[PDB]
């Protein structure tokens, strides 16, 4: 019974809408534009992870460092608790030493 008895409504995808059609444009902004701009400057997203990557602990540390003062109170409390938990887990748990 864990199965739907009707076909789901058809999902139509426009492969040639503007977003898909122009996807990838300016990814070579650096090597084709005399390196005035780095391609990572094209990234739109959270201010604390534009052109940067890390595990959950590093992401949380960076978020606290960069926008911690602007965070809501309980969100910041949750982030502090999460950093503490992730520190304990990554530095004290695991199969490997």
């Amino acid at each position: 019974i864990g199965i739907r008895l009707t076909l789901p409504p058809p999902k139509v995808v426009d492969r040639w809408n503007e977003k898909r059609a122009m996807f990838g444009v300016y990814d070579n902004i650096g090597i084709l534009g005399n390196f005035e701009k780095h391609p990572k400057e094209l990234i739109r997203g959270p201010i604390w992870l534009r052109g940067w990557k890390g595990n959950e602990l590093q992401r949380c540390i960076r978020k606290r460092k960069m926008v911690g003062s602007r965070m809501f109170a309980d969100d910041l409390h949750n982030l502090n608790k999460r950093i503490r938990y992730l520190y304990k887990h990554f530095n004290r748990h695991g199969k490997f030493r």
Binding site: E18, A21, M22, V25, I29, G33, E36, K37, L42
Partner: protein, 87 residues
């Protein structure tokens, strides 16, 4: 479709308004002005005379030099007296 205009660096110097509270403190000091002058030259609008130390800054620099960087003659004299003591 046509591509949106390519991203470009903002031309010329960028001067944040000091009145705004959200402007970072590093964008307001003299170091920012010096870097803007170096990057854009006269178009920056930075008065070139501000690049060198003001007389009080020069006095501080001279005091630090006198305190920590001895003259060649003083270094040689210290080396000579140390060698004499060792001998």
């Amino acid at each position: 479709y046509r591509a949106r205009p390519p991203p470009r660096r903002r031309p010329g110097p960028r001067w944040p308004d000091p009145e705004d509270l959200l402007t970072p403190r590093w964008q307001l000091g003299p170091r920012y002005a010096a870097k803007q002058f170096a990057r854009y030259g006269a178009a920056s609008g930075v008065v070139p005379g501000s690049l060198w130390p003001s007389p009080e800054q020069l006095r501080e620099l001279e005091a630090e030099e006198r305190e920590w960087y001895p003259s060649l003659a003083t270094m040689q004299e210290s080396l000579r007296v140390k060698q004499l003591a060792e001998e």
